[PDB]
Amino acid sequence: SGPERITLAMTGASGAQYGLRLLDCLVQEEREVHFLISKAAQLVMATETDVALPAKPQAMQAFLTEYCGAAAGQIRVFGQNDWMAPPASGSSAPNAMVICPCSTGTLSAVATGACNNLIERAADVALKERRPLVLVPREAPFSSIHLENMLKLSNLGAVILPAAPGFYHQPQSVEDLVDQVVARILNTLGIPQDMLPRWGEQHLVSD
Amino acid sequence: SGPERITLAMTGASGAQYGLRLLDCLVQEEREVHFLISKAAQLVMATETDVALPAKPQAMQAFLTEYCGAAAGQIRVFGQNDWMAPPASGSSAPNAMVICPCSTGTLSAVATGACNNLIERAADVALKERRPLVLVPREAPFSSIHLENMLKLSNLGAVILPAAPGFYHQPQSVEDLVDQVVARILNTLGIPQDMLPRWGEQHLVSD
Amino acid sequence: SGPERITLAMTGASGAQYGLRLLDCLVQEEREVHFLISKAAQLVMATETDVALPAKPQAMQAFLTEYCGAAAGQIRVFGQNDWMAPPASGSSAPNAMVICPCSTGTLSAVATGACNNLIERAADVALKERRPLVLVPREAPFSSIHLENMLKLSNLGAVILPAAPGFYHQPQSVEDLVDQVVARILNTLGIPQDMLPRWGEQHLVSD
Amino acid sequence: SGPERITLAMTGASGAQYGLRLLDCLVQEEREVHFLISKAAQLVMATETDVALPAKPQAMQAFLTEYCGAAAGQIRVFGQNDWMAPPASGSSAPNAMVICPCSTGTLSAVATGACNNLIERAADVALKERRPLVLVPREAPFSSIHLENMLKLSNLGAVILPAAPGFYHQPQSVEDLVDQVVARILNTLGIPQDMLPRWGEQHLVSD
Amino acid sequence: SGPERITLAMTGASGAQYGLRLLDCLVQEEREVHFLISKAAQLVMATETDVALPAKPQAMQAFLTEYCGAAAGQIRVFGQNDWMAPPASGSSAPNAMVICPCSTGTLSAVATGACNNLIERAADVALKERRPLVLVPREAPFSSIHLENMLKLSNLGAVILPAAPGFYHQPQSVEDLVDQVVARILNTLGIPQDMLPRWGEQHLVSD
Amino acid sequence: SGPERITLAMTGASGAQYGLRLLDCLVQEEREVHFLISKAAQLVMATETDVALPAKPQAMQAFLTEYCGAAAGQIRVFGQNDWMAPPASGSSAPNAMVICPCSTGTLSAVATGACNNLIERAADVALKERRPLVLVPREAPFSSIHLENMLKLSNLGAVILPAAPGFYHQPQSVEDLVDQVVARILNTLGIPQDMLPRWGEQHLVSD
Amino acid sequence: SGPERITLAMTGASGAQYGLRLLDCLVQEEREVHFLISKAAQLVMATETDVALPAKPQAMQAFLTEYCGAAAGQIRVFGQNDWMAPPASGSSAPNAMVICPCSTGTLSAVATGACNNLIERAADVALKERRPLVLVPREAPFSSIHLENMLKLSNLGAVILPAAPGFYHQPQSVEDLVDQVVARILNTLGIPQDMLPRWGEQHLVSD
Amino acid sequence: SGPERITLAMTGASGAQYGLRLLDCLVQEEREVHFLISKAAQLVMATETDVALPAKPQAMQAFLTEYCGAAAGQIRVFGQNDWMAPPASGSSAPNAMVICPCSTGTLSAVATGACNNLIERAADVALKERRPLVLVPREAPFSSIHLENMLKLSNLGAVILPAAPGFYHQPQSVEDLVDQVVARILNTLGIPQDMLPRWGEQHLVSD
Ligand SMILES: CC(C)=CCN1c2cc(C)c(C)cc2N(C[C@H](O)[C@H](O)[C@H](O)COP(=O)(O)O)c2[nH]c(=O)[nH]c(=O)c21
Ligand SMILES: CC(C)=CCN1c2cc(C)c(C)cc2N(C[C@H](O)[C@H](O)[C@H](O)COP(=O)(O)O)c2[nH]c(=O)[nH]c(=O)c21
Ligand SMILES: CC(C)=CCN1c2cc(C)c(C)cc2N(C[C@H](O)[C@H](O)[C@H](O)COP(=O)(O)O)c2[nH]c(=O)[nH]c(=O)c21
Ligand SMILES: CC(C)=CCN1c2cc(C)c(C)cc2N(C[C@H](O)[C@H](O)[C@H](O)COP(=O)(O)O)c2[nH]c(=O)[nH]c(=O)c21
Ligand SMILES: CC(C)=CCN1c2cc(C)c(C)cc2N(C[C@H](O)[C@H](O)[C@H](O)COP(=O)(O)O)c2[nH]c(=O)[nH]c(=O)c21
Ligand SMILES: CC(C)=CCN1c2cc(C)c(C)cc2N(C[C@H](O)[C@H](O)[C@H](O)COP(=O)(O)O)c2[nH]c(=O)[nH]c(=O)c21
Ligand SMILES: CC(C)=CCN1c2cc(C)c(C)cc2N(C[C@H](O)[C@H](O)[C@H](O)COP(=O)(O)O)c2[nH]c(=O)[nH]c(=O)c21
Ligand SMILES: CC(C)=CCN1c2cc(C)c(C)cc2N(C[C@H](O)[C@H](O)[C@H](O)COP(=O)(O)O)c2[nH]c(=O)[nH]c(=O)c21
Ligand code: NA
Ligand code: NA
Ligand code: NA
Ligand code: NA
Ligand code: NA
Ligand code: NA
Ligand code: NA
Ligand code: NA
């Protein structure tokens, strides 16, 4: 259940841990992942984590496959101008797409149709083909520029899913908070997850 | 520096820890706090924390004063229909106002001018007097209804500051994440804080 | 086929018979129903029908289970402030939601995001999770305020399904008219119904 | 009291019984009726009723006069391209106009100013002369296209009165439901009716 | 996979070959087709092709069945005012709908809700029932009137799929170009096709 | 007749054959062409054609001059950041400008004023000087993002001329289809062409 | 009085003399300046002035410090992708920001939220933190694209201060004109200047 | 080439030198000029220049004819309420119109259609007849009120040409700057000028 193939793009907002945890969960659910990452996101990851991600796609693909315990060819990695990759055309096989984290600059690019690199074109294709598109911005405050871009995209059917974890299961660790956002993304995609219980599911009637 | 008096309202989004930490920081900066809390927020706090907050304003005021180490009368607590309280009129002395957490229902009330209780009227007054108003929503996804309400209010000069902590100082605890959002709120108000360093302040020139 | 679980909310427009007939059909299709009812809707039902609906959720649940011939736990009843019930969070298991009848006040609440009670929050969650939301208003005239609220919600993907039965199968009773609207709701949800034939299904070619 | 002359147009939505009952009530209130009917409405009437309405205006006029017990010349019937009829020019004597039923296609024509036949031109004239215009759509769901057209026209002063009968007088027959809508139309026009009591008129003070 | 039943309407833009090729592919995928054609489209077909399409629905149905090699009753043909045909009511069994070619006049009719014939009403029903609607305009330049109509409909969930074939598989014939557009339509509907490969499907990693 | 100088920019939509055929026709009409091409368009041309276009402007200029049979200096080629070229300033001599093919990313850049390279700045100058600007997008579906960008630009006086060839002269080859679009572009510019007859020019009166 | 720290960005509009004169005045008022310059602005400066500005940030910093007579570390220079610099995060110490000259491309980037380099991100941060942002465009004509971008940003609280010097103090040199614009910028920031007298300050009453 | 007759209006923004230089260039190109000047512009000219312009139209006409070396009747001067002058009616012979300088008050009048004097009516006529209208505002900052007025007028086809001279030919005098704006106005009108070279005209290919 849910999509067999997910385009996962990481862009340069803070929150690299969310994208890595989501990649890991997707691999554990036996999904094929087309993995894309922006130059600024590579710097975020080097800044915020101890993951030493190689820069070139083939080396990055090898690295992420070992990091996640993925099967061979389960993770594809495509470079930022590789227009021969599936996500660049709506004639590709259907994927769901998630941008996590989603920088304000990528939010803006997708909202205006800029298509300046493969991540932006891929989201542009997702919208024109009416395939799932989930954006996970991380910023604060949100300015009116951010909010108008999110509103436009939500009105066009994108899911605006900010990295704003809930506290209602009493988190005990940073990892608990990361998992709550990742679980919400998986819920949105329709992919099984067991990190976030189904609210009130045992609640039969009011007190 | 910054406002001497802050109206701090807690409403029923998840994230009770943010409001309590902000209250604590405000008290430690010797600010007067006019504290307001919705019925649903009281349930969130009971659900997500071990804080046993008394229900009536006078008992709540005593409790919070001990919880924070506040001076006598530094924290005022007002009930949800107490139109005699300062926040209800623009002829009151100037306060900054923060709604943290800010539920989607309170976001909506403030965006449409509903003024159904003291928290909503207080924000309505803040906007009409052009006094600071900081809203800290916690929700995911944000629907187009949420986003249009945030956009309207941001366009009118409110600060939309979602509970979306950054990871770029490598948080080690839930408390580190809570402090990053609280530090941003204090920055927005112009109140000193030492939990979040000033980005790049020692960076003199590019490599 | 169609959703296993339906949140059915009744609010205070005239047309209590539509909600009761829909509840009955849903139970006969072996669906789980999370049943919600507003204080004004309780008065409509007492005014327009001979159904003596108990006021408290547990007694109401017992009553409706016998009224419909439902299996045990097939109908859940939740009170108007019970934020622990599944419909209040998008992390709940997926439901479709129907508000039938839908008062103009509830139409307005859902259109602005007011979330003042469980019915309003539940619809707010349905919209943010992109789950089905069917509103059945009953009013006449529709003012521009009603129409702008319906238009906003329809543009966001809600189904505006007014209680305006068709006459093209020559109804013979009030019950025939009620069934035509209920059949349309079930069609919209994708749930089998045999009260309303499929138009023109035997029509092979034009005369 | 109310208008002496009513242009009553029937167009091809389901609900032929509403137009016929309204015509009958208007005749019983000694009003002059300029009766117009679309080709699709003629098919609806043949489908949904046992009224065998002749096709040509003069024969239709004779038929409706006997059907209603009208006085001679009280009902005028005009064909769909008869630009010499009063409703086609604002220099005609003042009429109120009702389109009942109002198809979605006629709703659209009137909203955009299409004026493709006498019914559409007549409504266009009603709007430009600021004479009463009451539209009785019957459709479900209402799409955003329907809703934007109704909203535009309501904003211009038309009355959008959907065929959505209320149940709050406990209807016992289809005829009771038809009369509730017809009574609302007559109320809107300011014409006496005794089918629908005046709500709460004997209610002096609250319990 | 994909819809069992497709309403295929041809209207009077140039590109008759696209509609005929799509009809053929749909028949080869064992789909039921409800075929509709406008008077102007009949003239386009006579102008641009050597297909001698009979004018009356029954003869047209016989002709198209032989032209495509369809099974008996697989292709239904309905006339332009046949309101008894399934596409005219949302209570019909669910179809996807394609207008190919889509003239600018039909684009306009569907955008404003004109419902002047069965093709227009059928698309109006598709939108109100939230069933698939794919419009294939062929015009150049697109004026702002065309573009505002397409934008409105795309915002309401219609797919605007212009007859603008791609060249990236190096077409060798007019037929290759026609197949690229038809393949895109089938992709949009979710119907198998083998004329257009899935872009980059064998591309594992960037060079 | 028509402009003496045309800025022809090729960007990375499919349809490289259209730009090359247009360049050829312009040269055969003795027009001066300022030729610009994006990095992605160079990849399209290598993918979709057997034209081996050199990468550097001077070599590209030599190549295109031989390819077209142009006179010396009739084709100028400018690099993507060459702000000293005429198209970059409105104080240049007047040109008409055509972007053919026009990618969705360039459509977006021109619609928002991005001016990130010489093609984008050149179109920005064309709009501010009210000089002709013809955009030839090739995409399908057009999303609402594409359509809003085209609509904005058409409202500002740009010509949106999609690569959507007509079939009403019964094309026999891919080349016939390419020529129909190129002929429309030349018509739009006011430049003589003999590939597309003038519709109905010998038609004196209706049958 | 006025801000202690100013982010001064130069982008590629004509008017390099304005940015250099402003930098000089800021240094003479003992302000800290975080200096940013785009690649196109470097070409403008080389074209329009005899200032030989080194390309790398450290050499540029040394050069500008001598050019202005600045104290050590008073001018910081940051490269176009240096996300570790203060202006890139709202958690930095508060600055006012001026883009002078402001190209139409940078105007567009800031209006849409593109954040493609440090100048664009810095302005995006200024807007989200509600810190001063002054844009000094230099273009003529202003197209509707330019004007809509300026209007959006002015509505969000940016100051649109075009390089349009006044003549009402009878300028005698180009330098007089440059100083009038620079004086207006300093006035806007609240920084003392003595180049532009205060209009009418000695005017006590009308003649 | 270009218009034979120009309506040149001067209104009370700073920049009187621009209008006088433009008048002079127009006279040297043997154009007929219908010269209009507002009361506030007369005060600007007295303030900013040593031109002693007589107040009454006939004396002003004599003066300007000698100032420019104009032929007899080449410059017509019309008073501010002279509705018998050509510019007041669209039935006059075609002129291009320039308002230089254009005060913010005149910008506003023309944007709203105020027509309070001959300059405002003349621009209103230019817009309704679709004749050239060039506005040369001089103000800084531009407020959102200024920007919305300029945007409206630019969208209606007026040219918004702010007095914002470029520096890219290294001006040496105030006069050089004035000539750059005047040259742009003449370019916009299509009138020969030799003060501003054609950018890049000798640039054949990129380096
Ligand atoms: C401490 C800073 C600079 C703030 C947190 N953060 C962030 C952290 C780090 C450590 C780096 C380096 C960069 C950021 N940014 C800025 C962002 O990368 C820029 O807008 C950039 O152009 C994005 O481009 P892409 O869309 O990825 O192609 C960024 N952008 C954003 O939208 N949200 C963020 O949290 C942050
Ligand atoms: C697990 C649930 C139900 C989700 C997380 N969450 C939350 C947790 C708990 C534990 C409770 C009880 C309630 C919420 N809600 C719902 C919210 O309180 C309602 O909209 C309510 O009417 C708000 O009214 P006020 O504006 O405070 O007057 C709420 N609202 C919101 O905007 N964000 C939230 O995170 C949550
Ligand atoms: C004869 C009357 C008062 C009209 C028919 N009708 C109705 C019947 C009865 C018998 C009662 C008592 C109330 C109504 N109302 C009014 C409605 O309940 C109010 O707006 C109310 O606040 C709704 O709140 P909720 O959204 O349910 O929380 C209501 N509202 C509405 O939208 N449509 C209706 O038909 C009617
Ligand atoms: C079972 C069907 C097809 C649905 C109910 N219904 C209806 C019943 C019958 C039995 C017929 C024949 C037709 C309808 N229609 C379609 C409607 O007539 C078309 O839009 C038509 O062009 C209208 O043109 P006019 O505006 O009258 O000129 C129609 N239109 C509408 O707006 N509401 C309706 O209820 C229905
Ligand atoms: C060479 C002409 C006239 C242009 C190409 N073309 C076309 C070819 C032929 C050969 C015919 C006869 C007609 C067209 N038209 C005009 C179109 O049919 C009219 O708008 C007409 O009212 C459409 O009504 P419908 O929506 O079908 O009911 C039309 N309309 C359109 O939108 N795109 C087209 O390509 C063309
Ligand atoms: C099979 C693909 C990927 C689809 C057809 N096609 C295309 C073919 C080929 C073979 C390549 C390589 C690229 C495309 N693209 C994508 C496009 O180049 C990107 O948006 C790109 O950033 C454009 O940048 P520029 O505006 O030129 O600077 C593109 N873009 C577009 O708008 N229309 C197209 O047809 C296609
Ligand atoms: C004579 C020309 C080309 C006109 C005056 N001028 C200018 C002069 C020179 C000498 C150069 C080289 C460039 C310009 N430009 C074009 C501008 O740099 C481009 O839009 C460019 O992408 C800007 O990118 P950035 O925003 O700086 O990153 C530019 N842009 C602008 O907005 N205003 C200007 O005056 C001019
Ligand atoms: C130093 C001042 C007052 C600023 C520069 N300047 C100017 C200089 C002088 C010396 C005078 C006297 C007046 C101005 N004004 C104000 C302007 O004339 C008023 O809005 C006035 O009503 C205009 O009416 P009109 O449209 O001409 O009928 C004006 N208006 C404007 O739009 N731009 C300007 O530069 C200036
Ligand atoms: Na681009
Ligand atoms: Na209230
Ligand atoms: Na509330
Ligand atoms: Na007509
Ligand atoms: Na019609
Ligand atoms: Na740029
Ligand atoms: Na970017
Ligand atoms: Na006046």
PDB file of C-alpha atoms in Angstrom, chain C residues 22-84:
ATOM      1  CA  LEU C  22     -27.728   8.017   6.019  1.00  0.00           C
ATOM      2  CA  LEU C  23     -26.657   6.570   9.384  1.00  0.00           C
ATOM      3  CA  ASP C  24     -28.983   3.629   8.775  1.00  0.00           C
ATOM      4  CA  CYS C  25     -27.643   2.984   5.249  1.00  0.00           C
ATOM      5  CA  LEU C  26     -24.062   3.208   6.468  1.00  0.00           C
ATOM      6  CA  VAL C  27     -24.773   0.658   9.193  1.00  0.00           C
ATOM      7  CA  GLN C  28     -26.454  -1.633   6.666  1.00  0.00           C
ATOM      8  CA  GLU C  29     -23.286  -1.460   4.560  1.00  0.00           C
ATOM      9  CA  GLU C  30     -21.255  -2.674   7.555  1.00  0.00           C
ATOM     10  CA  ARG C  31     -19.346   0.603   7.946  1.00  0.00           C
ATOM     11  CA  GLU C  32     -17.975   1.898  11.216  1.00  0.00           C
ATOM     12  CA  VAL C  33     -19.557   5.288  12.018  1.00  0.00           C
ATOM     13  CA  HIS C  34     -18.102   7.916  14.360  1.00  0.00           C
ATOM     14  CA  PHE C  35     -21.263   9.831  15.181  1.00  0.00           C
ATOM     15  CA  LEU C  36     -21.222  13.476  16.309  1.00  0.00           C
ATOM     16  CA  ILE C  37     -24.183  15.784  16.898  1.00  0.00           C
ATOM     17  CA  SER C  38     -24.431  19.471  17.846  1.00  0.00           C
ATOM     18  CA  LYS C  39     -26.676  20.889  20.552  1.00  0.00           C
ATOM     19  CA  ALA C  40     -28.816  22.688  17.959  1.00  0.00           C
ATOM     20  CA  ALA C  41     -29.108  19.501  15.880  1.00  0.00           C
ATOM     21  CA  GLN C  42     -30.462  17.718  18.934  1.00  0.00           C
ATOM     22  CA  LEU C  43     -33.208  20.357  19.074  1.00  0.00           C
ATOM     23  CA  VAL C  44     -33.932  19.993  15.333  1.00  0.00           C
ATOM     24  CA  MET C  45     -34.313  16.242  15.772  1.00  0.00           C
ATOM     25  CA  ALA C  46     -36.719  16.683  18.702  1.00  0.00           C
ATOM     26  CA  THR C  47     -38.664  19.252  16.643  1.00  0.00           C
ATOM     27  CA  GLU C  48     -38.878  17.474  13.286  1.00  0.00           C
ATOM     28  CA  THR C  49     -39.048  13.792  14.234  1.00  0.00           C
ATOM     29  CA  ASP C  50     -40.434  11.412  16.846  1.00  0.00           C
ATOM     30  CA  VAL C  51     -36.942  10.070  17.571  1.00  0.00           C
ATOM     31  CA  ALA C  52     -36.231  10.573  21.283  1.00  0.00           C
ATOM     32  CA  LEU C  53     -32.457  10.746  21.212  1.00  0.00           C
ATOM     33  CA  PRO C  54     -30.775  10.570  24.641  1.00  0.00           C
ATOM     34  CA  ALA C  55     -28.431  13.479  25.367  1.00  0.00           C
ATOM     35  CA  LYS C  56     -25.296  11.842  26.811  1.00  0.00           C
ATOM     36  CA  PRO C  57     -22.907  10.048  24.420  1.00  0.00           C
ATOM     37  CA  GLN C  58     -23.030   6.592  26.032  1.00  0.00           C
ATOM     38  CA  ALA C  59     -26.844   6.537  26.174  1.00  0.00           C
ATOM     39  CA  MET C  60     -26.983   8.019  22.687  1.00  0.00           C
ATOM     40  CA  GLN C  61     -24.672   5.268  21.450  1.00  0.00           C
ATOM     41  CA  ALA C  62     -26.880   2.550  22.949  1.00  0.00           C
ATOM     42  CA  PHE C  63     -29.980   4.169  21.465  1.00  0.00           C
ATOM     43  CA  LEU C  64     -28.617   4.565  17.938  1.00  0.00           C
ATOM     44  CA  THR C  65     -27.244   1.013  17.950  1.00  0.00           C
ATOM     45  CA  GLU C  66     -30.744  -0.342  18.588  1.00  0.00           C
ATOM     46  CA  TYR C  67     -32.370   2.155  16.198  1.00  0.00           C
ATOM     47  CA  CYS C  68     -30.153   0.975  13.334  1.00  0.00           C
ATOM     48  CA  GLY C  69     -29.629  -2.663  14.171  1.00  0.00           C
ATOM     49  CA  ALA C  70     -25.900  -1.990  14.391  1.00  0.00           C
ATOM     50  CA  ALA C  71     -23.326  -4.456  15.686  1.00  0.00           C
ATOM     51  CA  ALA C  72     -21.569  -3.744  18.992  1.00  0.00           C
ATOM     52  CA  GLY C  73     -19.056  -0.897  18.669  1.00  0.00           C
ATOM     53  CA  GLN C  74     -20.013  -0.262  15.030  1.00  0.00           C
ATOM     54  CA  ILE C  75     -21.398   3.166  16.035  1.00  0.00           C
ATOM     55  CA  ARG C  76     -19.103   5.283  18.226  1.00  0.00           C
ATOM     56  CA  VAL C  77     -20.527   8.474  19.746  1.00  0.00           C
ATOM     57  CA  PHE C  78     -18.232  11.312  20.803  1.00  0.00           C
ATOM     58  CA  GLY C  79     -19.115  14.473  22.743  1.00  0.00           C
ATOM     59  CA  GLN C  80     -18.604  17.966  21.431  1.00  0.00           C
ATOM     60  CA  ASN C  81     -15.358  18.662  23.318  1.00  0.00           C
ATOM     61  CA  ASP C  82     -13.824  15.181  23.338  1.00  0.00           C
ATOM     62  CA  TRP C  83     -10.408  15.927  21.850  1.00  0.00           C
ATOM     63  CA  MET C  84      -9.310  12.367  22.657  1.00  0.00           C
TER      64      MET C  84
END
